Symmetry: C5
């Protein structure tokens, strides 16, 4: 298994690391049909989503998607610094695959 | 694909944005049958609900409804500023579709 | 839908509003068989339960009963002021139907 | 229903009340197979478990066992004073049936 | 049942205790397919994983794996001192079986 988010990210196509080293500026979530998603931004203007669960996702990802939205919410509310995001870059906004928090 | 709550809200019929830029004044939740819901207010008098799950809701919204009530409760307890709500305005109280939190 | 806990409470038989405007003094929870419940008290001694799930509850209430116990626990730990409880008064301790929190 | 943890405890065989009036000293949790459990200690050395789910448990206890482990973790992290534990004393460590928290 | 993490750890093949007595330095989690995992590090450079659920796990471990990730996140965010980890040291990074927190 990978030892860090960068090596994990590199195991997948259509991904990249964004380095933030900053707390989340805004947290948005929706229960509207077909847009059951979260959106976060940073004060540098960067915007990211947790995608709506879809047919691209495998069964094991369903709980992890829910966990990620839990993580983003509590990160936002505690002003935790986000180090990096691994995202898929074939979606707009870029879609979160992984998060690291440090410092 | 929307990048913010206003753009997401605009995808639906019978919605509008309310801008609060304030913490939640009160949080109410009920387990009574057929009224399994939450109600929030703001000091300006505005009142909003998370609707009881109904047949209007598609299957994917049910999990998101539960998440929204989790979000409103922890927002209330942490005195987090709510930036905007996207609501359906064909319900009273207006029914929450999405929330953004920012300072 | 109800605008507030008082109007909600009025929709049900065997209920009353208790106005506390105080934090929870004690929180008790049990996993013992046939007593899977929570009990709260306020400083003055007034005691309330979240009932064990039973035949009187409809299925939609089950997730809400779990949510209420989550709410009481976090309210207790954060010393959140409880405004009102809507309770069924045909049970001892009186059984919580809804809670409102306001500072 | 019982008004308090002491009266609840007395409804069961093989139980006793421990009166701690103290925060949890240590919190341990395990995902190892057949030891999916939590263990807590107090400064006085007293040690308690939340048992692995087993044949002695009834269905209604399953969610309550999971809730108890949630409660112990957050109690530990917030340094919440535990008033009493109701435990089964036919197990070692004594097995938690109920917890009360009060200032 | 075991009374502490060291005795619990010793019930299993291919494990060891690490004594950290330190807060978690970084927390990483992933929803990427087949890497639905968490990774933590400590300032001394030690790295640990919560393994992706797989065929080596029995059903009862699944909820406990999810719990462990919840615990590591909140331990990280609260800067809780981790006393010990029980890990399987036949994986890289070492895979967490249990955690103790004290002091
Ligand atoms: N990637 C796809 C994105 C594109 N979008 C565009 C918007 N589309 C909206 C479809 C989701 N459906 C509804 O929203 C909806 C809500 C409805 O009631 C509202 O339901 C609301 C709750 O959902 C609320 O109760 C309100 O008061 C009722 O009037 C009713 C119906 N309906 O009768 O079909 C549908 C989906 C496809
Ligand atoms: N869609 C429109 C929404 C509007 N709603 C508003 C409220 N109305 C609620 C009806 C749900 N039913 C009950 O609540 C209920 C509770 C009951 O027991 C109480 O159950 C209580 C727990 O629910 C408690 O245990 C108490 O002690 C028992 O006596 C009994 C019965 N009953 O015998 O019919 C009903 C329906 C319409
Ligand atoms: N609706 C009215 C409510 C009133 N209640 C009050 C309490 N009464 C409780 C009955 C539930 N049963 C048990 O508890 C129980 C636990 C048991 O094992 C303990 O199981 C315990 C865990 O549950 C623990 O592991 C312990 O070490 C074992 O010996 C065994 C048995 N049994 O062999 O019958 C029963 C029923 C009536
Ligand atoms: N009531 C007493 C409880 C204690 N006792 C412990 C030992 N078991 C033995 C039967 C299990 N057989 C295994 O072979 C086994 C291998 C395991 O290692 C692997 O699975 C692990 C995850 O579970 C790791 O992935 C590890 O790397 C991998 O090698 C883990 C476990 N387990 O239960 O967590 C079991 C009997 C019960
Ligand atoms: N085992 C260690 C990792 C190795 N890894 C790479 C090789 N795959 C092979 C089979 C998976 N095939 C995919 O094609 C695939 C596409 C993905 O991208 C899409 O799904 C993503 C969400 O999962 C995004 O929506 C994205 O936009 C969309 O393009 C994502 C994943 N995934 O697992 O998260 C898999 C197995 C896994």
């Amino acid at each position: 298994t990978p030892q860090n988010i960068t090596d994990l990210c590199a195991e997948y196509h259509n991904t990249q690391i964004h380095t933030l080293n900053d707390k989340i500026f805004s947290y948005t979530e929706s229960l509207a049909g077909k847009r059951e998603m979260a959106i976060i931004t940073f004060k540098n203007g960067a915007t990211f989503q947790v995608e709506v669960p879809g047919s691209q996702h495998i069964d094991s990802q369903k709980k992890a998607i829910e966990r990620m939205k839990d993580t983003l919410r509590i990160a936002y509310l505690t002003e935790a610094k986000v180090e990096k995001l691994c995202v898929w870059n074939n979606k707009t906004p870029h879609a979160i695959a992984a998060i690291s928090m440090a410092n």
